[PDB]
Amino acid sequence: ALVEQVRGQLQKLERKYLELKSQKNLYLARLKSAIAAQKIEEIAGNLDNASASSLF
Amino acid sequence: APEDLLERLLGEMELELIELRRALAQTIATFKSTERQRDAQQLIAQRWYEKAQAALDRGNEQLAREALGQRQSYQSHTEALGKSLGEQRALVEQVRGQLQKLERKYLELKSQKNLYLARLKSAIAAQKIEEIAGNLDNASASSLFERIETKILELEAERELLNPPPSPLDKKFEQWEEQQAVEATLAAMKARRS
């Protein structure tokens, strides 16, 4: 019984481990997308925004 | 950590087992020596007895009379040793039974030593992994998704603030105007060809 039940834990646990890994990159990619997009519009706001446009 | 004690305690037991193991031979060693002396003493009397056969022979009784008197001194010693040999037998027999029984128990405990150690390690390894998952995935305070995804909204919320979305006003005007742009332009399309 011990060897059977313990294997079930290992069998179930391994499936979960890779499942988390799949979402690891998915959320990381989304974070980077916003991070990259966060600054560019800030530069445009600091560059073009008619209020205090450094450009024009 | 009690686990190291389990291995260490048996090691100390093993030293005592060999210590007792050597001790038993010492008891056996003296037992053999006692047996030899009894055999030697009877031989001395046996030589006197074997000699006494000739001493009594030819009618020279007086020589035999004195000879047997000397024998009795050895006979008394012989009897005492024989009694000692018999009682020593019980001690060697019973002590071996203890050793015979004790050794069987020793290995029996060793069999369960690894069995419980293995189960402990299994739970120990499995104990932490789910704790990480609880600290990682658990929707309450998931470090993986909930806390990370909250930061996503923070950046998302800023874009509308820094770039105010056009009011819903303009959407309908362009859509209202867009249909005329296509229709008015297409009105010429259907008209120019027709």
SS3 annotation, B51-104 = HHHHHHHHHCHHHHHHHHHHHHHHHHHHHHHHHHHHHHHHHHHHHHHHHHHHHH
A34 reaches B (C-beta below 8 A): yes
Say whether A33 counts as a known binding-site residue.
Answer: no
Report residue A55: phi and psi, to 5°: -80, -55
Between CA B15 and CA B70 the distance in angstroms is 51
Please enumerate, as own/partner, the contacts of B157-163 that have beta carbons within 8 Å and a separation of 24 or more: B158/A38, B159/A37, B159/A38, B159/A41, B162/A41, B162/A42, B162/A45, B163/A41, B163/A45
B162 reaches A (C-beta below 8 A): yes
| Contact yes or no for B41/B74 (Cβ under 8 A) | yes
Between CA A47 and CA A41 the distance in angstroms is 9
Between CA B100 and CA B18 the distance in angstroms is 13
Please list, in sequence order, all residues whose beta carbon lies within 8 angstroms of the beta carbon of residue B51, skipping any fewer than 6 positions away. B67
The single-letter code of the amino acid at B179 is Q
Between CA B83 and CA B86 the distance in angstroms is 5
Between CA B137 and CA B112 the distance in angstroms is 37
Handedness of CA B15, B17, B19, B25 (dihedral sign): negative
Between CA B10 and CA A36 the distance in angstroms is 63
Say whether A53 counts as a known binding-site residue.
Answer: yes
* Residue B40, token pair as written in the block: 């030697």
Nearest to B109, CA basis, from B6, B3, B4, B1: B6
Q: Using CB atoms, which residue from B126, B156, B158 is nearest to A9?
A: B126
The single-letter code of the amino acid at B24 is L
The DSSP secondary-structure symbol of B139 reads T
Burial class (CB in 10 A: 0-12, 13-18, 19+), B52: buried
Report residue A54: phi and psi, to 5°: -65, -20
Q: Resolution of this entry in Å?
A: 4.2
Greatest Cα pair distance, chain B, in angstroms, is 177
Q: Where are the beta strands (DSSP E) in B104-148?
A: none
Mutate to test the interface with A, among B119, B148, B156, B162 (most CBs of A within 10 A): B162
Q: Please tell me which residue of chain A has the smallest CA distance to B151.
A: A31
| Contact yes or no for B160/A38 (Cβ under 8 A) | no
Handedness of CA B149, B150, B153, B155 (dihedral sign): negative
Q: Are A23 and B145 in contact (CB < 8 Å)?
A: yes
Method used experimentally: cryo-EM
- Alpha helices by DSSP H, B137-167: 146-162
Q: Tokens 């022979």 sit at which residue?
A: B57
Q: Are A23 and B119 in contact (CB < 8 Å)?
A: no
Q: Please tell me which residue of chain B has the smallest CA distance to A25.
A: B144
A56 reaches B (C-beta below 8 A): no
DSSP-derived 3-state class of residue A50:
coil
B120 reaches A (C-beta below 8 A): no
Q: Please tell me which residue of chain A has the smallest CA distance to B162.
A: A45
Handedness of CA B101, B105, B106, B108 (dihedral sign): positive
